[PDB]
A paper describes a structure:
The Mdm35 homologue in mammals is [name] ([name]; alias [name], [name]). Although it was originally identified outside mitochondria after activation by p53 during mild genotoxic stress 16, later experiments established an evolutionary conserved function in complex with PRELID1 for PA transfer across the intermembrane space of mitochondria 8. [name] thus contributes to the maintenance of cardiolipin (CL) levels in the inner mitochondrial membrane of human cells, thereby sequestering cytochrome c and stalling apoptosis. Crystal structures of free [name] and the [name]-SLMO1 complex reveal how [name]-like domains could be stabilised during mitochondrial import and the location of a buried phospholipid-binding site.
[name] possesses a twin CX9C motif that is predicted to form two disulphide bonds within the oxidising environment of mitochondrial IMS 17. To examine the folded state of [name], we crystallised it as a fusion protein with maltose-binding protein ([name]) and using the coordinates of [name] to provide initial phases, we solved its high-resolution structure. The structure reveals the characteristic α-helical hairpin motif that is stapled together by two disulphide bonds located at C8-C47 and C18-C37 (Fig1A). Electron density was not observed for the C-terminal 18 amino acid residues suggesting a degree of conformation heterogeneity or flexibility in this region. Oxidation of the twin CX9C motifs in [name], and its subsequent folding, is also believed to be promoted by Mia40, which produces an identical arrangement of the two helices (Fig1C). A striking difference in the structure of [name] is the prominence of an exposed hydrophobic stripe running the full length of the CX9C coiled coil domain (Fig1D). This solvent-exposed hydrophobic surface is dominated by a series of stacked aromatic side chains conserved in all [name] homologues (Fig1E), suggesting that this represents part of the interaction surface for the recruitment of [name]-like proteins. Remarkably, this extensive hydrophobic surface does not induce specific multimerisation of [name] when free in solution, as NMR line widths (Fig1B) and gel filtration chromatography profiles are consistent with a monomeric species under the conditions used in this study. It is conceivable that the concaved shape of the surface frustrates the association of monomers, but provides a complementary assembly surface for induced folding of [name]-like domains, which remain unstructured in the absence of its chaperone and then are rapidly degraded by mitochondrial proteases.
Numbering used by the authors: 1 to 421
Amino acid sequence: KIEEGKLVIWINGDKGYNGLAEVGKKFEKDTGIKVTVEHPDKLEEKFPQVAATGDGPDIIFWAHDRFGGYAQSGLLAEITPAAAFQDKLYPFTWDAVRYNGKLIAYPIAVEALSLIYNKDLLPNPPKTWEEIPALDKELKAKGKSALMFNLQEPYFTWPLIAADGGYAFKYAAGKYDIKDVGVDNAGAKAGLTFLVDLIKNKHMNADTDYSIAEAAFNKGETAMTINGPWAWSNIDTSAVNYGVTVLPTFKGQPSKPFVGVLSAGINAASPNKELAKEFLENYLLTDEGLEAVNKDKPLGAVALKSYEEELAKDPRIAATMENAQKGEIMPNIPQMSAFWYAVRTAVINAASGRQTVDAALAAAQTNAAANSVGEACTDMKREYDQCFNRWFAEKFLKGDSSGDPCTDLFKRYQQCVQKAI
Ligand SMILES: OC[C@H]1O[C@H](O[C@H]2[C@H](O)[C@@H](O)[C@@H](O)O[C@@H]2CO)[C@H](O)[C@@H](O)[C@@H]1O
């Protein structure tokens, strides 16, 4: 299980994990407390599995959308920064990591997708998605192409899908409507249909992934890609001369990327919660800690005000913020995981031709809604069970029963299930 007196951090392999390891070395030099940074594959799915057994990292980095799920399953410690420390970060970043009235992580940086373009191939990038076919056709005649980006992660296509009206979950009055997923409407279909038509008219390849799109852009073969701040670093070392700009408009509407707050949460099973708090508040979330990470791979717009004021001079960051403001902060509810799985499949199926746009999205809507409501019914069940298991062991089995207290909890659960059907 987790080791006492040591910090183990998990963070995604596309981030500045070597720079974070330098912050960890500084912590060790000051305190003698070893910090180890790992980037396991699919860490966002591995974390819940290992943490549920009380193993895993002391600190986990991911975008904020996954944290509500982790918190709801009891996998994260509550965090309680002093007022003085909170005021060092932008208030909207705290909002992203608030779940059920509690803070469940520290906000690190704001990530949004932008359009990245090769200035030598394309000194004026297109303002609209509708121009892309004609641009591509021209470029293919010269043995180049217009645009390549990662089709295998729905994060990258969502901005298009959402531009004319696709959504995830309704929000109103402090509550997400989990019965209703917005992935099957006219705007969602128009967006995805545009994408599939790019593929059908040979302007993109259906199995373009992160690495193929990254190699194609940084080797000068394609004129544009869609990516986050983390990717700028590899383009810097390539021979490509790039700019970063607002995503193209669709049906005259802004693309709407789903905006992530890269966040650090503390494993509820960690024996090192105080050391983790010290590391995060006094080493990572400082101008020099963020600089060391940023130097490795750009973080984006950082949550820390003092450092963001220096980063705001970078036009790449201004573009990141332009796109962020046109997009939307992701929800952090546990259902988000089901939303993404379902959109991932729909995109891949429609892009590869395994399903039509209309059947792919209809099926995503159905499966996301079912699992989302299912996760609520499961939470109602778990609450019944906690009440019953408590009552049965401490009351019934001790011969001190005069009725089952946990009947209304069951009926609420029963109603959830029977309504879902
Ligand atoms: O593709 C769905 C995926 O989107 C987001 O993951 C992003 C992440 O926020 C970024 O930091 C970056 O690393 O790329 C990921 C996409 O590959 C969501 O945060 C994630 O929950 C979801 O599965």
